[PDB]
């Protein structure tokens, strides 16, 4: 792991681990999820950002997750050396953005890609607002020109989605997070939503499909005595409207829609 | 990763990653015990296997873990290196045992160490098997001759009688059922889960307090991925030992019994 020469962005290589891999032996999402973390974790400590900036400290403010949106065209085999190259950009005064690129250490091509929405919030109170140009301002860690992953118009990560309506076609009740679904904060890691979010896709699909695209909004955060109900309806290639709700008020925590292509 | 020098033992460092540490920012049991499974899994391909062996591959049989120990002095912080080395024994006709030692890449001291006890059973009638003299001559090659345990004491922790829980347990955590992240790349529930559902019924002040430094497991039966478990704890005591049972949340089915030790902070 290590900043690039301009220092505005970084990379990290990283081998497939046995328990990373799913039943075709590649890489689950919610392991590329995690390195993606990972990488994004390590180019904030080589920056001097320790376990937010100074000012984010002195009032109480937080960067929380709004849209994770992750594209993959080959999924790493177990033993597989992957490459990733992540960085930040401010999108004005709505928030910040974070891109990846995931690409094969032997070949050098792009075998995936993701893009993530930021916004600020408070700690405790938990609102929003975003003006900060003191915050702003402390930009020297991102490329002043645009660098997207996603730059093509009209692409899957900028797209509304819609609210899944009732009946559900298919569904995975009781769902709730254990100690190892938490973080350092005590907080449900937001990867565990992925895996909420693919609980109620049917073994059928996943046996004879492979993962191309998932798009998730993040709309509240799931907390340790919570329970979820994740919901999935086919909208169509394999095309999924999902929907995580709270078991007990049917509270929304989550909406989004995977893209699933034939093996 | 690499064989040690003898080839009769392999080496591989970790740094331990922001997702892997809980919230005194050290890594988890469950981080250590996914880092001992992944150095045994390369010390089987780096001495030519996918455990199986010609003669298990030929009669559908396969390794099975009996029992899991691990003792913690430290737990390796976020972005520390952890170096482990571990190795096979031939246990007569039971089995094989595996071990594991964790050391500091810094320092260099003993910051932990495992066992697993190991059975032969047949993949399909889930039979088991008391290992045969043409496997026992396969993976003897790859094993020290000469006794060499993690845990050598006269009256080690690791080869004490776990009892059954009797009801009512002190604490409970009903209603656990795995997702596909806790499945392997064979569909069945990874050993490590059975670690994080024990723990499951243990309370939250015991963990916000004390720090998890012994853990033993015995492996009864698997729990299928449209299994529910029921977790089941009871304190059996500056220290404090839990008894722990895991079991099916319909007939009550026995699938894990354990222990676990902790120290005060
Ligand atoms: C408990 N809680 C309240 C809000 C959240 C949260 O993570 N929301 C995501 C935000 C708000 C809209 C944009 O993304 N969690
Ligand atoms: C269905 N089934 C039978 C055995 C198992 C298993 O995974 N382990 C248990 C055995 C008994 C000795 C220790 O391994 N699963």
């Known amino acids: 792991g290590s900043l690039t020469e301009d220092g505005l962005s970084y990379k ?4 497939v681990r046995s328990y990373e891999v799913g039943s075709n032996k590649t ?15 390590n180019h904030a400590q080589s920056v001097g950002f320790s376990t937010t900036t100074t000012t984010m400290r002195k009032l109480h403010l937080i960067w929380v997750t709004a849209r994770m949106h992750i594209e993959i ?8 050396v992957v490459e990733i190259e ?3 950009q401010s999108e004005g005064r709505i928030g910040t953005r974070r891109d990846w690129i995931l690409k094969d250490s032997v070949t050098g091509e792009v075998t995936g890609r993701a893009t993530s929405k930021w916004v ?6 938990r609102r929003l607002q975003k003006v900060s140009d003191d915050v702003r301002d402390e930009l020297v860690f991102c490329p002043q020109e645009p660098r997207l992953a996603f730059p093509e118009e009209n692409n899957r990560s900028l797209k509304k989605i819609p609210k899944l309506e009732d009946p559900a076609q298919y569904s995975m009740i009781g769902l709730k ?5 938490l973080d350092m904060n005590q907080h449900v890691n937001n990867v565990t939503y992925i895996g909420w979010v693919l609980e ?15 798009t998730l909004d993040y709309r509240r955060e799931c907390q340790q005595d919570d329970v979820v109900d994740s919901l999935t309806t086919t909208t169509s290639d394999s095309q999924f409207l999902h929907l995580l709700r709270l078991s007990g008020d049917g509270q929304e925590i989550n909406r989004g829609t995977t893209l699933w292509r034939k093996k």
Not at 12 to 15: L, R
Not at 120 to 125: A, C, G, H, K, L
């Open 73 to 80: 065209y080959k999924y790493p085999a177990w033993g597989d």
């Open 120 to 125: 600020m919030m408070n700690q405790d109170t």
């Open 86 to 88: 992540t960085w930040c």
């Open 27 to 41: 890489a689950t999402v919610e392991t590329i999820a995690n390195l993606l973390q990972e990488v994004g974790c």
């Open 200 to 214: 109620s896709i049917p073994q059928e699909i996943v046996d004879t499909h492979e993962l191309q695209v998932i």
């Open 177 to 181: 997070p254990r100690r190892a679904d």
């Open 12 to 15: 990290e290589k990283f081998v």
